[model samples]
Target: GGLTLKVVTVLEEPFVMVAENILGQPKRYKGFSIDVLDALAKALGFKYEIYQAPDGRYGHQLHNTSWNGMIGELISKRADLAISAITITPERESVVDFSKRYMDYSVGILIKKGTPVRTFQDLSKQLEMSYGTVRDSAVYEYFRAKGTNPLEQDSTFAELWRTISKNGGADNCVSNPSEGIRKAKKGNYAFLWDVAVVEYAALTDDDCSVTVIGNSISSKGYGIALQHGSPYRDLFSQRILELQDTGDLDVLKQKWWP
Candidate 1:
């Protein structure tokens, strides 16, 4: 069949961005993820028309058989795919299909350029600065699990979680990474999030006022999502791996990030 594929997406600054007045079937997209989309399409003859997800969320499972955002669209059969640098999680995998992890990302720290902190361990011990991430976000939830779980008692992440509570409790959390970065701009706060996010801010902030700490706290893969049991998933996955093998992935990364 020559029918076009439907892709559900939400804009993230450096990944998938909307192009103004640029429409092929009356709408178009550009950026890092889009480049990957283009590569996948060219390789597999995939014709896709992307629409932003209705709720602008990555997908949250509120309850049994109820989901919303990108993953929700897939469950509802509204789209065949999602490509938003979505982190592959066990919970997400249980519901829909995920392609091979295209990129590795991590929860990274953001701080004012001269904040005198080089690591989370430093931020963990200092009371003068508060820290947090998006509410119920992957970063927030990841910390909640490992930071409190008994098995990881020797981990500094666990200790950092305790300090996070004393600093502001719920008040430490922000609605998005940008808001968190704004707090960093004002000084005396450390905002943690996927480096895919905070790293762009560190590089582009006014006068380069912010910078990411050298260390990343956790490692996970960013993958494509599809309808459960989708036949096309593996095709896309293999192409993604091939793109990395050919170095085209790096070329696109530089074109968008710089």
Candidate 2:
């Protein structure tokens, strides 16, 4: 390996996680994205070091006209690669390049077990629930674009759940796929988030307390982010295709999703 690339990521379960004992030990990173990065680096004959995004955001340009999180790190050239569960988008593509999409996902609803609401019955029909989502998330943007006015947005999933838990039978919303599943297990709240994450949680939930409902509201793909017009883009894309062709990607999905 000629260079040790700086890889940026956010802490998202199944995608990335900081292992225990990291406080006084080496910066330990693991999860689906880390494993994928490992495979690619081995194939490409390179090395990399993983670090969390400073702001803990996946990346979004807020109303103030500034970018933060993993996308910001890539845009600033402070990081050479961004893995984790970053979604590919047209707006992001304008500023940075991405490898071929390796994962497909969509927004789905999460509800507590035994909850009566089984599906998204159509927002126009009535104001049946108080819905909210993580600020700056793709899910939030989707609902916002549909003219869903003043839907509550929270900085963290915990806060969103806290607000929802106070009142039973009140419809609520969440964008963090993992947090959505976790919170829904408590009863009374509905979460809309990535179907892939929801599926994973469903299969692994110890209490079997939550279930994904309704069809996906939107479809998206996850890709590795790099600098705009980066020289490594094509190479990374090639490695991704090799991983897919060889069924390594599916294997990784099985490893994490199961």
Candidate 3:
């Protein structure tokens, strides 16, 4: 027991979720990522408290400007490590040093039960099948970068919802993978765009089916996030490498996978 480091997490299924509760707070999240962080902190001889922020926006406090959301958190001397399933990307690297990847994931589209939008070619033709994506996430950037030109909605995952709602294109954002599933299950859009495995799990229901289409836009290891040049970088990296070499990390993969 010690001065626990302040940590923030997102509620992405199979990764993190809102657990029971503590006192009156509601958005309390729990999952694999949190469990792993508990183990990591114990290994390092420290304790921590996790806050449930949709994104890492809780920075130091628990609000929008919170240090948890963006790279600026580290630059502003906010929290320490970000244990969220933050994909390792070059843009993130420019602001924060990441630990050895804890896991890997690929991007894909999460379509409804029987919409039949399986390929990019299919999507291009079915402009009426609205689409949406999470805001300020790799999902958004990937499509934007490729000039996929999804219909625009002001909401979080307007890009994906556009197709189901038939209201527009990819611009209508839904927020994250879970919301993508939520929208897909609602039978509103043609498909949901998100991480491959994640969307697959969400589509487990026979009614709101999901199929992976197209090559992954980006593939990289997920890692513990540290402040740029933080002293803990070396230790985080070294320990992770050891875990990898010892096959401990594989144990997690096997445990989590079906």
The number of the candidate with the highest lDDT is 1
- lDDT tens readout by residue for model 2, 1-258: 377899998887788988766466778888988888999889888989888888888787779765788888988899999998888888888888999988776777666566455545532222444444554565765754544334535333333334443343134544455556666666645666777777767777787777776465567788999988899999999999989999999999999987
Kindly list the per-residue Cα lDDT of model 1 for residues 56-88, writing each as its tens digit.
999988868689999999999999999987888
Better candidate number, 2 or 3, judged by TM-score: 2
- Which regions of candidate 3 deviate over 4 angstroms? 1-4, 22-29, 53-70, 112-137, 148-179, 186-192, 200-208, 254-257
**What local lDDT does model 1 show for residue 141?**
70
Name the TM-score of candidate 1.
0.90
Superior candidate under lDDT, 1 versus 2: 1
lDDT: the better of candidates 1 and 3? 1
lDDT of each: 0.83, 0.73, 0.60
Per-model TM values vs. the true structure: 0.90, 0.77, 0.66
> Could you give the candidate ranking by TM-score, starting with the highest?
1, 2, 3
Predictions: Cα RMSD each: 2.4, 6.5, 6.6
- Judging by lDDT, tell me the better candidate of 2 and 3: 2
